[PDB]
Structure 1
C-alpha cells in the first residue's frame, strides 16, 4: 500500500476505536457508531489517509447497525480480501490507499441496484459535509 505506515503518528492522531478498527480489524458494535443513520450530503473518507471512499448518494437503509453503501466511489479505492476469522468466511474491505480495515461486503444489498452491502465501521471513516 502506497500511503506510508507511521504507527506512532497513528496512535497519537486516531482514537482508541479508530485505531483498533483500522489497524487491528476490530468491529464497532452495531448501533454504536457515529455515522450509522447519517443522511447528510457529503463524502466518507478513510479516517487514516483521507482518501474519498463512499458518497452519501450510495448510502442506504440496511438496518444492519453500521453505515452501509451499495457501491464505493470508484472501483479502485477498495481492496477486497477473504476473511476467515470468527468462525466465518467473509469478504473484508480495506482502504486501497493505506490498507486500513474498513469493514465487510455482503451480497444482500439493494436488489434494485448493485445487490452489494458495503458494511463499514463509522470509526474507519470521517464525514465531509458537502
Structure 2
C-alpha cells in the first residue's frame, strides 16, 4: 500500500471525532454493542471509493464493471486488503468477525459465514462508517498525509 497506515495522533483523533455526529460516533467508535447492518449502498454514483468516515482511508471501491459476487453490495470490491482488518473474537467464534479500519481501528461492519462460494463470506458494511469520493476527485485526507492520499483514489 502507498498509504500510511500509522494511526491518527491523539490530537488528530480528538479533532476527527469532534467532527462526527452522535450517530457516527455510536457506529465508528464502539465495538460489540450495536446491531449489525448490511448496507446495500444504492445512494451514490457507481464509480468511486468509500472511505473510512473517521480517518479518510480508502476502503472499498465501487465500479459499474465490478463483479465481486453476492457476498458484497452490488459493484463493490476491496480497495486494498491491507486497509481493513478482520477481527476474530472468542465471544463469537465462527458466527461472525468484525471488520475495522486498519488505520484508526474504527468499526466498519462484520463478515458473516453465509455468503456464496468460494469464500462463503458476506460482507455486512455499515453505511454510517463510510464516506464517498467519486472517481477523479481527491481523497478527503483529513490526516493531511503526503503522497497517494493527496490524489484521487
TM-score (norm 2): 0.62
Residue ranges of structure 2 left out of the alignment (5+ in a row): 136-153
What residue number does 1:128 align with?
Answer: 133
C-alpha displacement at 1:2, in angstroms? 2.2
- The 5-angstrom pairing of residues 31-110 of structure 1 reads 36-38=41-43, 40=45, 41-57=47-63, 68=73, 71-83=77-89, 89-110=95-116
TM-score (norm 1): 0.71
Structure with higher Rg: it is 2
C-alpha displacement at 1:129, in angstroms? 1.5
In structure 2, distance between residues paired with 1:50 and 1:21: 16
Whether the aligned pair in 2 keeps the contact of 1:106 and 1:119 (CA below 8 Å) is yes
Distance 1:73 1:17, change over 3 A: same
TM-align CA RMSD = 3.4
Distance 1:76 1:98, change over 3 A: same
- Alignment length, in residue pairs? 124
- The structure in which a higher percent of residues are strand is 1
C-alpha displacement at 1:109, in angstroms? 3.2
